[model samples]
Target: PAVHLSPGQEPIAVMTFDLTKITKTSSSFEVRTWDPEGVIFYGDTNPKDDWFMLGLRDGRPEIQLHNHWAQLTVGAGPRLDDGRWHQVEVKMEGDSVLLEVDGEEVLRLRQVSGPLTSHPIMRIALGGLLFPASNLRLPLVPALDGCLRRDSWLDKQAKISASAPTSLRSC
Candidate 1:
């Protein structure tokens, strides 16, 4: 399914800072597996079994995309395709969400004016989905590049975080 977009399915540019300032959150924070067009993924957290749910709905109300498209405004929390752990920070005072990967600030979005409807899924992927290694025979268990640790500080500064869950198998 790694094909180009159709004519009707042009690039759906995501706006920056659709909603911010978590006046109220249903849950503290959440982590689960997601089927992003059948791409298996997962996340590792130090807190372990703890995450926050943004809204009450299923997807972001401010972000209403008919079909699945890459989101730029939201930062790397969701659409991080690289192989690393992404840290998402929501600021209640400024009404903003900052994305940090490897202890660097990559993307930032403004706050929305009104309430939200849809909800966003978890960052980490889990079992059941087709593992990336499945492409070959006897796929091996995959893993993330880094866990939730911001100890080192690179010159570039923390930025967006992506993932490429890898595994081992007997070939």
Candidate 2:
């Protein structure tokens, strides 16, 4: 099952998960927000737009970050896919955003600002970003084809809930 969060928490100070891709699609997102109006998002944004994402980039594991003014990405590592379990992490510290694979740092951004959306609600999705087809240029960004376990966000370890549309799933 996936986890949901309350809206009042600070930007995710830390996020970690385990991923194993089952198949190759254009883009596979491991974590995302469910809002179409814009919020916090982390995953693949490819074959469409290269806004900001943290997943396979051209079949290679990478981290991309974007805001209203600028965008930054850090790749050139090994492929995140291979039918094997890989530990992934995204963390926000001070004004910096960090990405780590296994236990080593792969990318970091300093002096980052204004990447979060102004949406009223904030809910997290583990396997993919769930949104209406009408909200996206494409029908959907393919949901993760593999399994995700031990998914967690922030260090508070709190589980919050709110009633969302039935089409939305919260844990």
Predicted structure with the largest TM-score when compared to the true one: 2
Clashing pairs in 2: 4-171
lDDT of 2 by residue, 9-126 (tens): 1222222222121111112123322222222234322223323444454445554444444465556455555655556667765556666766667776777643332122223443
Error of 1 at 125 (Å): 10
In model 1, which runs have C-alpha deviations exceeding 4 angstroms? 1-93, 113-171
The alpha-carbon deviation from the true structure for residue 77 of candidate 2, after best TM-score superposition, in angstroms, is 3.2
Question: Model 2, which residues run further than 4 Å from truth?
Answer: 1-52, 73-76, 114-121, 130-141, 155-159, 162-171
Candidate lDDT values, in order = 0.24, 0.40
Highest lDDT: give the candidate number: 2
Backbone clashes in candidate 2 total 1
RMSD each, Å: 16.2, 12.0
